Amino acid sequence: MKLNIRAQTAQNQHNNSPIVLVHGLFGSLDNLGVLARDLVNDHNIIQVDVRNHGLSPREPVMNYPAMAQDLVDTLDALQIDKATFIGHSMGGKAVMALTALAPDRIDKLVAIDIAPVDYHVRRHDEIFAAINAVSESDAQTRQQAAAIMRQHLNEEGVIQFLLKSFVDGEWRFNVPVLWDQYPHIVGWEKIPAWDHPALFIPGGNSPYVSEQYRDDLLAQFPQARAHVIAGAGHWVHAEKPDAVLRAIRRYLNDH
């Protein structure tokens, strides 16, 4: 289905393909804004809210072919034939899945701290507990919500990231569905090889793109290029946006 988006025209015409930015689990279209603010200098930008996030529609189904189709439907809605896609984590998996569903609609591809693999672990139980605790309380403001979340989480950055989706005393993301479909989100459906250069940007202090996932990564992205950002965790763009942008532009210029 069509997604909620925020589009901005390039400040300068350079004959570049437009860039679609796709956030990760519990995120919203504002999360990759730091990248959009730089890339809009020479590209039309489209920031999307993934289904069940932000102000995009809710749907009980949450799998990658579905998220990939949403991207196609969104491109069709904006009458864009082909675009470069940049996705973080879950968003990166949606973009990678798009290569299998509609390769002709993709120009270049950037996957931030994510590998095309089923991680086979639960990594968000405490986050779900914090989210539910906030909902069960009488918290209305982000300050009140933060106080409760700190009782479950000790990573202030994660708490603030989640709170970007706490508005009018309600979570923007669809909690029951993200919980129910969680295995499919941390999971993956293997795809055919995409024989085109693809950029992967892992955080040096993150296990999302470690060596144990390399064989599977290359089997699906034979021409994958990895640019590890030293001293960065999972939300690489939030910690080292400059380093991420340098890697992105080097790839986009493909000299």
Phi-psi map region of 152: left, alpha, beta (phi>0 left; psi -120 to 50 alpha): alpha
**Environment class of 144 (CB within 10 Å of its CB; exposed 0-12, middle 13-18, buried 19+):** middle
**Per-residue H/E/C for 10-34:** CCCCCCCCCEEEECCCCCCCCCCHH
Beta strands per DSSP E along the chain = 5-8, 19-22, 45-48, 83-88, 106-112, 166-167, 170-171, 198-201, 224-226
With contact defined as beta carbons under 8 Å apart, do 227 and 247 qualify? yes
Question: Which among 43, 88, 234, 237 is annotated as catalytic?
Answer: 234
With contact defined as beta carbons under 8 Å apart, do 59 and 181 qualify? no
With contact defined as beta carbons under 8 Å apart, do 181 and 63 qualify? yes
Residue whose tokens read 């979340």: 149
* Residue 253: CB atoms within 10 Å: 7
| Three-class SS state of 60 | coil
Residues 6+ apart with CB under 8 A from 18: 43, 44, 45, 46, 80, 83, 84
- What is the rounded distance in angstroms from the CA atom of residue 145 to the CA atom of residue 7? 30
- What is the rounded distance in angstroms from the CA atom of residue 52 to the CA atom of residue 185? 12
Residue 30's closest CA among 173, 234, 198? 173
Residue whose tokens read 């030293």: 230
Residue 229's closest CA among 110, 121, 124, 118? 110
* Residue 136: CB atoms within 10 Å: 9
Instruction: Output the DSSP codes for 207-232.
Output: STT-GGGHHHHHHH-TTEEE--BTT-
| Furthest C-alpha separation in the chain | 55
90: its two tokens: 């879950």
Is residue 17 flagged as an active site residue? no
Is residue 23 flagged as an active site residue? no
Angle at 83 between CA 39 and CA 63, to 5 degrees: 105
The CATH number that applies at residue 233 is 3.40.50.1820
Give the range of the structural domain holding residue 17, as residue numbers without chain letter.
Answer: 1-255
Question: Which among 56, 89, 165, 206 is annotated as catalytic?
Answer: 89
Residue 111's closest CA among 2, 15, 196? 196
In this structure, what are the phi and psi dihedrals at residue 119, rounded to the nearest 5 degrees? -75, -15
Residue whose tokens read 């069960």: 136
> How many structural domains is the chain composed of?
1
Residue 162's closest CA among 178, 138, 183? 178
- What is the rounded distance in angstroms from the CA atom of residue 41 to the CA atom of residue 127? 36
* Sign of the alpha-carbon dihedral angle for 90, 96, 100, 101: positive
